[PDB]
Amino acid sequence: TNTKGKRRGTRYMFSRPFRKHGVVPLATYMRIYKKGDIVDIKGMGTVQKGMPHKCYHGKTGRVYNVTQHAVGIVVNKQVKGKILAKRINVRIEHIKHSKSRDSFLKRVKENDQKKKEAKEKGTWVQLKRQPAPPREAHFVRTNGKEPELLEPIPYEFMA
Amino acid sequence: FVKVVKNKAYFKRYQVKFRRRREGKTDYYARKRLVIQDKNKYNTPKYRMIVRVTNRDIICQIAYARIEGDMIVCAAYAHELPKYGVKVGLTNYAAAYCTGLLLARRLLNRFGMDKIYEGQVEVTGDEYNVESIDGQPGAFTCYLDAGLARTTTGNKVFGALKGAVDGGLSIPHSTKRFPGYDSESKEFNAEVHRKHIMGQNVADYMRYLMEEDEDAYKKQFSQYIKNNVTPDMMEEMYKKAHAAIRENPVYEKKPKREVKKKRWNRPKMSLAQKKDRVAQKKASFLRAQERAA
Amino acid sequence: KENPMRELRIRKLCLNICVGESGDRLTRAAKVLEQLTGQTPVFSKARYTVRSFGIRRNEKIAVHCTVRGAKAEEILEKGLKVREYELRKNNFSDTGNFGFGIQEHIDLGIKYDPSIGIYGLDFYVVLGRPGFSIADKKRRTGCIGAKHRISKEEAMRWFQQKYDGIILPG
RNA sequence: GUCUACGGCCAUACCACCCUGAACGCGCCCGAUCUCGUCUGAUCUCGGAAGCUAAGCAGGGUCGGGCCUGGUUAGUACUUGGAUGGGAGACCGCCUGGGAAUACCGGGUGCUGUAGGCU
RNA sequence: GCUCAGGGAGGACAGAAACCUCCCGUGGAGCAGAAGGGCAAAAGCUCGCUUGAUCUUGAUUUUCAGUACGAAUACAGACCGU
């Protein structure tokens, strides 16, 4: 039986990177988290105030509360069969915004603009996407010169 | 021999500190407590008053910090007192007070807050604080960045706080550092604080030296004799300089002068040319070797 | 010929006496360094316990006295009457700070007091140049170049030429 | 071009020597009557403007050490899935896809806001 | 406010080791204790002052039946420190 002991098997999890100990750089501090925003979690060793438990490290989850020093945030997390989603409070250093939540807010600008413009002249503007379709025929022009005869190579010992 | 300390290893593992520490100016510990804002206020910027006192002069900016990097809403320096009838006295406790009052009356000139909040016209020399009225725009509530200035009961950085509050700002402050405060008896003196602001602490050292002998009067108060600044027009003059700040606060600049277009500093030598420098050094060592032998 | 900003002045004159007793033997080592200078010296304390001499943890040992400036040539010139205007080629360090001392205090000019006594002393001048200052201030500190550093070859010629002294190997 | 005040990213920015600084900055500097602190106006606080680019700082320099980013190592090591494949075992062949790191050889050597100037 | 483990070259008796200096130094020290993390104008050395180690209703994390204790996180209201 292993131990219970909140920071167990975090020997390399809450560490710092090589040539990155020391002072907390200051931009980290000064970016406004709003309610709703989607966010991803990653403990930091430098500040022992405000950590999440080792299980939520790695995950992702939207915000529901803002105060002086923290944010309250909703994640999912398994357990045996079922999925309990749950409210955990964390200090700001152990957090970034979520970064596949702004490739959607700039294609929605491209999708809104080209169904109001391109309508008054007369063309249908396909905004839906399709996964890589199967390629079609093409010519391959030799230019006087030719291909190469790759015979394979005979064994030799090398030690 | 001794081991060498700084060998290949040493550098491989090195972590340099931030730039502004290597240079040696910013103190991050305090900055971090100073610059930032409590999340449940969002953007609603925090405000400071920077003060610095250079060798020959004084500087007074005001700022709030953005992520891209902090922004100076307004600056009134101590090299512009040449334009308010002040020929000398540009580094001193008395001229920390004018460069603090220039900043306040210039910032209240820039947002439509001229008539609201006057502060003080008479220099009394005691604890003062700015209220907020009904049905009018409110007061400024910034803080004091002190830099790396040992903060002791007598220091010109505090001269610049008291300059801005008497103009019309609501900065939180204390009289435990303002000159005159007897730290032994524990009461705050009024008219020893007033003697240092107008500039009669510099007046004692003209009559003390000249009555003793004419030797140390020469190197010390030399540009005082040069511009005609006697001890009689010492308090006659520093009551004139606090009226032109109130009358004419707004800033006026020079035009951008025409460019000759010439090179002073050296450009970075080229890949080719650095290679040009290592087939002539190698070759000319080996010709003079056959010349020597 | 030379620039006027390199004038190798004297910075400080460190003076101390080492005794090894706690009582009336230590207080009389501060009276000898107060009849010459004119400023009271501070008593120091220890690092650890090695009974072979016998100075317990934080039991008092030595007493020191720095003075600079106008009082950096009146005391130092008295000590060179007792050292007869000479040093050895193993008294200089490898920055450029020259070390010497004397056996007793009376011939420096101080009169013998019956109860205080006589105590040997341990001189140390510290050379410099306007701008070693830099490396000590709070605000914007730096180092001090290499053409500005003193060597073991600019503390020698400064001594033998002005005072008409002598220095000998071994 | 360049520099000051306050910065964001934190070595393409650090370290060792060496060659250049014109105007305005910024500094070494000279004081200790008052404010403030020292065994010592050295530092810390305060007043000034006789002296010089020697230094801190800036630009450049170096078959320089590091740091950052390519090429070799290499489709070599490892691998998901697979067949009633070989072999006494150890372990190793092919099937279907994912693919690492030195040594050795290249080149680069800080960008960039907010606000006052100077050529 | 101040910077260490340790290293070199100097100095009266003083020596391997008493204490004074100048230069080199990414922490090789230190932070009550097992061991891992974390920290250099400090979380470490030294002074100054003090007692948020005070009273009080809820949310949450951890072990989990998503019950108890134990211990932990993020707020609100007193009166206080510096």
Side-chain angles (χ1 to χ4, degrees), chain A residues 39-86:
Chain A
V39 158
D40 34 36
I41 306 173
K42 185 192 188 197
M44 190 188 285
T46 43
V47 175
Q48 296 89 213
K49 286 231 56 46
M51 286 192 276
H53 192 243
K54 78 210 190 198
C55 90
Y56 303 93
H57 185 279
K59 306 263 177 288
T60 298
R62 84 206 160 75
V63 180
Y64 84 106
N65 161 51
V66 207
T67 77
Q68 282 71 8
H69 288 357
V71 286
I73 113 182
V74 163
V75 242
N76 300 183
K77 132 167 188 142
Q78 279 263 29
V79 112
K80 281 157 268 262
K82 69 215 198 302
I83 290 175
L84 299 193
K86 43 190 305 213

Side-chain angles (χ1 to χ4, degrees), chain B residues 48-59:
Chain B
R48 55 194 235 261
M49 202 222 286
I50 297 162
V51 197
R52 291 294 177 279
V53 177
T54 312
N55 264 18
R56 295 209 149 92
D57 225 34
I58 302 151
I59 320 151

Side-chain angles (χ1 to χ4, degrees), chain B residues 23-268:
Chain B
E23 305 183 28
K25 314 191 176 155
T26 298
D27 197 292
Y28 278 112
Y29 207 98
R31 173 159 228 267
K32 182 277 211 61
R33 318 311 184 73
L34 237 136
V35 84
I36 77 179
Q37 194 67 318
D38 301 321
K39 297 293 130 187
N40 48 352
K41 336 252 215 84
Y42 311 78
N43 329 166
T44 319
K46 197 156 152 207
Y47 272 129
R48 55 194 235 261
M49 202 222 286
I50 297 162
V51 197
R52 291 294 177 279
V53 177
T54 312
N55 264 18
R56 295 209 149 92
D57 225 34
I58 302 151
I59 320 151
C60 265
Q61 294 163 310
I62 287 181
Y64 67 116
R66 287 271 150 285
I67 193 185
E68 320 86 32
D70 47 359
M71 296 192 302
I72 296 315
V73 78
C74 162
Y77 306 82
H79 71 64
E80 290 147 25
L81 294 175
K83 306 192 172 186
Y84 301 113
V86 185
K87 304 296 106 171
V88 288
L90 263 71
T91 213
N92 44 1
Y93 194 95
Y97 191 89
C98 275
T99 311
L101 186 63
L102 218 166
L103 178 56
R105 298 315 312 172
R106 189 179 285 182
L107 192 75
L108 271 50
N109 181 264
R110 287 157 86 162
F111 311 130
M113 307 190 289
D114 174 42
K115 297 288 101 180
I116 318 107
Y117 311 122
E118 323 300 55
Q120 293 289 119
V121 180
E122 255 78 60
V123 179
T124 304
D126 274 312
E127 184 181 13
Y128 183 75
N129 46 309
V130 176
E131 285 188 300
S132 70
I133 314 151
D134 252 299
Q136 293 266 233
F140 216 83
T141 163
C142 64
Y143 316 119
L144 217 268
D145 188 303
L148 315 171
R150 189 59 266 251
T151 49
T152 56
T153 306
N155 159 0
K156 294 182 283 195
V157 165
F158 286 105
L161 139 53
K162 198 75 191 169
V165 175
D166 296 354
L169 271 51
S170 190
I171 294 178
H173 62 121
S174 176
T175 74
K176 218 182 174 192
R177 302 305 101 155
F178 289 138
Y181 181 93
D182 204 54
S183 199
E184 192 166 3
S185 297
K186 287 178 189 174
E187 242 79 63
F188 169 49
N189 212 111
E191 219 83 331
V192 180
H193 182 234
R194 204 205 158 282
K195 290 267 183 178
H196 278 257
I197 291 167
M198 300 298 289
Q200 210 81 237
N201 81 308
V202 186
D204 258 58
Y205 206 28
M206 300 192 72
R207 305 136 181 166
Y208 190 98
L209 295 174
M210 193 163 181
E211 202 268 296
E212 195 185 332
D213 53 314
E214 308 300 325
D215 301 341
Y217 177 52
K218 286 158 182 162
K219 187 171 72 179
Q220 183 90 44
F221 297 108
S222 219
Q223 249 72 2
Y224 288 47
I225 298 160
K226 218 144 161 281
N227 277 295
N228 298 299
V229 174
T230 57
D232 271 48
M233 201 185 154
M234 195 79 72
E235 209 189 331
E236 310 244 297
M237 184 266 294
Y238 255 102
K239 286 191 180 176
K240 285 293 305 187
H242 295 129
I245 296 162
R246 305 278 280 210
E247 193 83 336
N248 215 320
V250 74
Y251 194 41
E252 288 170 300
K253 298 186 74 179
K254 255 182 190 142
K256 294 192 168 173
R257 185 162 165 166
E258 210 81 69
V259 184
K260 294 256 217 309
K261 282 301 317 194
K262 67 201 307 311
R263 181 155 206 95
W264 294 109
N265 294 25
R266 216 206 182 170
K268 187 164 271 154

Side-chain angles (χ1 to χ4, degrees), chain C residues 56-92:
Chain C
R56 296 209 306 281
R57 184 164 179 285
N58 282 241
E59 193 237 285
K60 299 184 187 176
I61 305 156
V63 51
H64 43 274
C65 175
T66 40
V67 195
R68 306 171 189 267
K71 191 72 78 82
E73 184 53 35
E74 232 284 349
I75 298 168
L76 191 274
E77 194 61 37
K78 291 162 160 280
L80 296 173
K81 173 153 185 162
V82 186
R83 257 289 144 195
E84 62 164 290
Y85 293 96
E86 72 186 59
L87 309 168
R88 274 218 224 288
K89 297 282 289 311
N90 50 334
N91 279 56
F92 289 77

